[PDB]
Amino acid sequence: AGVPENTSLENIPVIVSKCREAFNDDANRDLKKRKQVLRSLLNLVEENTDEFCKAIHRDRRRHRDETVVMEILPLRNEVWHLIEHMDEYVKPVKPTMEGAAALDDCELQYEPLGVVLVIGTWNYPLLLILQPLLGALAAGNTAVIKPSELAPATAELLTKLLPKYVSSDVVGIVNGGVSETTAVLKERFDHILYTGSARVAEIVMAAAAKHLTPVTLELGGKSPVVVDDTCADNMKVVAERIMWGKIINAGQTSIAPDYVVVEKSMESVLVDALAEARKAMLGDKFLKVLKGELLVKQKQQFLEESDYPRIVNASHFQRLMEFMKGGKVAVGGEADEATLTIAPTILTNIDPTHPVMQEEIFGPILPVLTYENEKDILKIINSREKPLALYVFSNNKRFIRGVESRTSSGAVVVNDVVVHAGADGLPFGGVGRSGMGAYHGRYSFETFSHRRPVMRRGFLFSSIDTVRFPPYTTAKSRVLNSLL
Amino acid sequence: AGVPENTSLENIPVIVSKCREAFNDDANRDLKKRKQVLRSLLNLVEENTDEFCKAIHRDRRRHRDETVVMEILPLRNEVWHLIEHMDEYVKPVKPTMEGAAALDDCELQYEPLGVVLVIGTWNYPLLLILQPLLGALAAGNTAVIKPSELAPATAELLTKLLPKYVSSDVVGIVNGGVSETTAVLKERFDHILYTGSARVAEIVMAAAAKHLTPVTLELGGKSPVVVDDTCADNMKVVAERIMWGKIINAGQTSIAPDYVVVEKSMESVLVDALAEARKAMLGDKFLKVLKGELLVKQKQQFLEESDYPRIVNASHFQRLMEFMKGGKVAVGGEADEATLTIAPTILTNIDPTHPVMQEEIFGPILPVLTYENEKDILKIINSREKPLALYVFSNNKRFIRGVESRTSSGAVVVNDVVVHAGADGLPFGGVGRSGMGAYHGRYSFETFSHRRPVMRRGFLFSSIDTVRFPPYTTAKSRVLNSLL
Ligand SMILES: NC(=O)c1ccc[n+]([C@@H]2O[C@H](COP(=O)([O-])OP(=O)(O)OC[C@H]3O[C@@H](n4cnc5c(N)ncnc54)[C@H](O)[C@@H]3O)[C@@H](O)[C@H]2O)c1
Ligand SMILES: NC(=O)c1ccc[n+]([C@@H]2O[C@H](COP(=O)([O-])OP(=O)(O)OC[C@H]3O[C@@H](n4cnc5c(N)ncnc54)[C@H](O)[C@@H]3O)[C@@H](O)[C@H]2O)c1
Ligand SMILES: O=Cc1ccc(Oc2ccc3c(c2)COB3O)cc1
Ligand SMILES: O=Cc1ccc(Oc2ccc3c(c2)COB3O)cc1
């Protein structure tokens, strides 16, 4: 118990070769079949919500309610959306035609691609393996899924339960870390969706080139939060939204607030408002125990039993504790090694060249930098990689529009964080080293489909026949010259 | 004269670094600037149409009227379309929202990506270097272009003329073959558009992974033509369209008729109709000379002065002459080595395992296979790579729809060939080993742009705040349970 079986290398081609045949044999082509399968994955989630929450707790130490909001309900809404709008999404589109081809009958049809690979990640292990899967299967593909090994209990359970609802020839499973994942990537797929680090994204895309496979890459970077000096009266909402977005999963969220850029005059009030938000959300007893101002008979036991989630492993814990040395610990600072607990920490007087402000934090550390004018914002943000998310807290329509226009990022949100990702009708995806492609809803269906142009002509005379057919007469030249 | 100067490896980073700065300095951001630049490229083409036709003749031995129809006028129409619809295309789109986020203000903005690399190919050297370029610049990118070295005169002239209209810091030039092109691909770009072979596409995409650069890959394969037994009365139109599509560029066109699949009873009538179409288009004197039934004082001279185009080099000539040994020469067969002339040839009694029916022909050889029923069509077509183009000649609504549904290809055309590629309002691109991504018009602008979601919220209470913020109370659990 605890982990899934590492898939044998001999079986990895067998698993992909079976899904190939399935796709080829029309296993998931017809709309009746796609809806059954999308319904069976709704049952998987709805009937075992309890067990999944318990599994995701053992891996992440997330609370059931945190998990319900962040994973369970977004996956229910995705299944609902895709069944409701499938008949809309399959149907051909009449493009607007211009010039000669406007006399013809033209059409954009959507057709499946074939076998899709989903490679997943540990921080939201169900959501980030199944939400891609729903989209692939909604578009008439068959699929192979590779769960993160850094959430073994969630990989174990899903491996246990998924084949009771959906057959392995329709949705295949491969478990393991680097070796098992390198073997699968040697196999031919028609689209790969990958979530993870840019470093590993380069190796996937290198694998994808072997077979010319289109990739959708869901990556990270340092999502900035810009706070201006028009939010004074709302500072408690600004603080609670930014602190919520960081507290969730102990910061280990790709769209979380990575650092803040605050207008020089609003620094003190934001920081203090973040500290009160923090205290409200983590609760008094918890922070006293972590700090050591209150003793408990079984300290390790108590932290493992808390509402606050853990860091994934010892290496990322230590990395995050060394980032504290890149500034002044204004708020927080508290950690415990044996339960991989690091409470949210706000750092001031940042050396902007320190690793904490060069690499993605992906943890509870939140640096706070200031800006006197808009151009100091732009040299901070645009000197770095294009981030997955950009956040602006402001009531000024000029200041918001000016920051949008002058920066590039996966998404912008004005006056909140994170929630755009759950929003029905927006694509979710990066740009530059935050990624390429997008998915969710219509955009997963569009991503996992080939848009196929179809032109219908008759056998009768039309404009084009005056100039196309050789021989190239002098009369044909004088007609074409007259156009130029 | 003849060729451009091979770009020095020391200058290749300098050239890309200059376009980077340009993009970064807003060289092509504002709409006034993009339209000037698109107008200056209209002037480039319009004012030097003559010289380009002469250059493209020396490389391809294509007639000025062939070139005007296939390259000059499609590039004029593209410039036209992009200036006319730019103000449409820049504008944000209001996606349809559902659930919670429908209370907010949501938006899809389009923003430039940065520096775009266009790698070109020899067979339509101007069209397939500039049409990508127009789309990149219409989307607010700056650009680097790499002309095929297998059309040196067209590369020379464009290198001569392009910087007189548009500055090198806005549109950079790199000339050379394998070495120069490997050096450029070591540099960072924000999108690559490549036209060429799937073999070399894999090496480009491998380069693109180094920097996580999104690729649009414009490739080939064997575009089938399916002829049924409902076209008897129209056989002269069917034959002249298929023979036109092959005659152009001596077959060296990625969307040309590669082979035919004819219903068993219509074989003789199609083949003979293709032979009469061939004779009509290439003219009697030409074919007699080529065959040797009519002599001329300077044979080599006469063929170099003809309207029929040449094979790119000796290697592809010999390859195409060995394909004649994969069947019976029903129509044609005639060749001359010193002018790299191979007249269109129809082969019957094909060994379907012979290289002529395994690899892309890209030449004047046209195999003809038969089918008794629809499933014989499907095992021919679907046993091979997904092709760029699929063509169906038919008047039966059931037979057409059945072939569309059961095959995958870059585009379908019913009752013609090639022209879909010039059609305003369809995307042009492949699928599988015919390619990924699409361009032309709106679709080039969409390809060379990041679609950026933007969510705007207010600071007041809303649906989401009932469940998101910790601490995780029992009252918060009972609210979330009631939803499940
Ligand atoms: N935008 C999103 O949807 C999203 C969501 C979650 C996380 N992320 C990003 O993920 C990033 C990194 O998380 P991580 O570093 O724990 O990811 P990771 O290292 O766990 O990688 C993810 C997947 O890649 C596989 N992998 C690891 N090394 C490999 C190799 N050498 N070859 C092949 N496969 C390999 C793993 O098995 C795993 O399934 C974060 O920085 C975050 O920003 C993005
Ligand atoms: N769909 C389309 O738009 C389209 C249009 C024209 C041609 N094509 C296809 O492209 C192919 C054209 O033939 P081709 O094979 O002569 O193209 P090609 O081999 O000349 O490749 C195109 C470009 O790649 C470069 N190149 C060649 N080898 C390289 C290497 N090792 N590293 C880096 N760069 C390299 C060349 O300099 C050239 O500019 C055909 O198969 C045809 O079907 C497709
Ligand atoms: O790390 C990346 C990531 C991406 C998407 C996530 O899914 C959410 C779905 C719905 C909602 C939220 C989040 C927050 O509020 B929602 O309504 C969570 C994490
Ligand atoms: O081999 C690949 C390829 C790709 C695109 C081509 O450009 C065309 C543009 C416009 C038109 C056509 C063709 C035919 O009629 B048109 O008006 C030609 C060849």
Numbering used by the authors:
A (entry chain A), B (entry chain B): 6 to 489
Q: What text appears in the publication on this structure?
A:
Part of the initial identifications suggested a specific SAR between the function conferred by an individual gene and aminomethylphenoxy derivatives, mediated by the methylamine moiety shared by the compounds. This gene encodes a protein, TbALDH3 that potentially functions as a trypanosomal FALDH based on our crystallographic and biochemical characterizations. The monomer structure comprises 485 residues from A6 to K490, and adopts a canonical ALDH fold that is composed of an N-terminal NAD-binding domain, a catalytic domain and an oligomerization domain embracing the second subunit of the dimer. Interestingly, this C-terminal structural element strikingly resembles the ‘gatekeeper helix’ that is unique to FALDHs and is involved in regulating enzyme activity and substrate specificity. Moreover, the difference in MS between M1 and M-A1 correlates well with the transition from aldehyde (-CHO) to carboxylic acid (-CO2H), as well as M2 and M-A2, suggesting it is highly likely that M1 and M2 are the aldehyde precursors of the carboxylic acids M-A1 and M-A2 respectively. These data collectively support the notion that MAOa-TbALDH3 can metabolize the aminomethylphenoxy derivatives in a stepwise manner, i.e. the methylamine group in the structure is first converted by MAOa into an aldehyde, and then is further metabolized into a carboxylic acid by TbALDH3.
To understand the reaction catalyzed by TbALDH3 at molecular level, we obtained crystals of the aldehyde-NAD-TbALDH3 complex. A micro-reaction chamber was designed to serve as a physical barrier between the two reactions as well as to minimize the reverse reaction; meanwhile, a cysteine to serine mutation (C259S) was introduced in TbALDH3 to entrap the hyperactive aldehyde metabolites by abolishing the nucleophilic attack on the carbonyl carbon of the aldehyde. The NAD cofactor is located in an extended pocket rendered by a Rossmann fold. There are two hydrogen bonds formed between E365 and the hydroxyl groups of the ribose of the nicotinamide, establishing the key interactions between NAD with TbALDH3 in addition to an H2O-bridge that connects the carboxylate group of the nicotinamide to Y444 and T200. In this structure, the benzaldehyde benzoxaborole substrate exhibits distinctive electron density, being nestled into the substrate funnel and adjacent to the nicotinamide. Specifically, in the catalytic pocket, its aldehyde group directly contacts the catalytic residue (C259S), and also connects to N128, a residue whose counterparts in other ALDHs are involved in the catalytic activity by directing the carbonyl carbon towards the nucleophilic carbon on the nicotinamide. Noticeably, the position of the substrate is relatively flexible as indicated by the B-factor.
